[PDB]
Copies of this chain bind each other. A is one copy, B any other.
Amino acid sequence: NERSRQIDDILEKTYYNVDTHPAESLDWFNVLIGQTIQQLREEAWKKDNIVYSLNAFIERKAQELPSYLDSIKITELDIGHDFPIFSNCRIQYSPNSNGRKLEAKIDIDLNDRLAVGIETRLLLNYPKPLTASLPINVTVSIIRFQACLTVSLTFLMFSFAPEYRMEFETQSLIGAENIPKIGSLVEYQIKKWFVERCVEPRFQFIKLPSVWPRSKNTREG
């Protein structure tokens, strides 16, 4: 009732119609986003920061990981040299909510080299118990990401559509290569963390700080 009325007030006072407006370019967002992400990439010790960050998470959660694997060390890790591109930005009503809230709908595409270098063994029991676990150097990459993303504010609600494109470029080395079940399994775990946290119908709400101008937030140069 009055909720849909409020959404109508927003839409009317904003030069926007849900059924007739065309998509928007959104490139400046890719420019400033490219600035921030260039800034995060150029942090030299953040490569080690997230080497440790990924390590710590992986070790505790290892029971969810396949049991035939041993200890998981990361010896290689690359971030890339390209940037994500947003385009086709829409505004729709929130589904299943009878016209309660509004939300943006942006297309996103990314192409670069996104690699992680694993070093693991493969144990089996109970002979003898403990086996001559062979070594695996598992360099796994991601190269393309096309997604249809939903944003909104109530916090920062955003998530992906389940019909997303995720392209993996996996390689391994065992004792003394291009072995597929490795890449398919790493795909299972990666898309398990991903769908577990950041895919419909499971969103991620991020805290919204106050933007009000305050004197403890004023600098110059």
User: Footprint of B on A, CB under 8 Å?
Assistant: 6, 9-11, 13-16, 21, 24-28, 30-32, 34-36, 38-39, 42, 81-83, 85, 89-91, 101-102, 104, 151-154, 156, 197-198, 201-209, 211, 213, 215, 217-220
Contact = CB atoms under 8 A, between A and B. Distances in A.
A30 B15 contact: yes
B32 A16 contact: no
Contacts of A85: 14-15
* Chain copies in complex: 2
Contacts of A83: 10, 13-14
Q: Which 4 A-B residue pairings sit nearest by Cβ, starting from the closest?
A: A10-B34, A205-B219, A24-B25, A14-B30
Contacts of A207: 209, 217
| Chain A facing B: main interface SS | mixed
Nearest to A37: B10
A206 B205 contact: no
In this complex, the member of A10, A31, A85, A203 whose beta carbon has the largest number of chain B beta carbons within 10 angstroms is A31
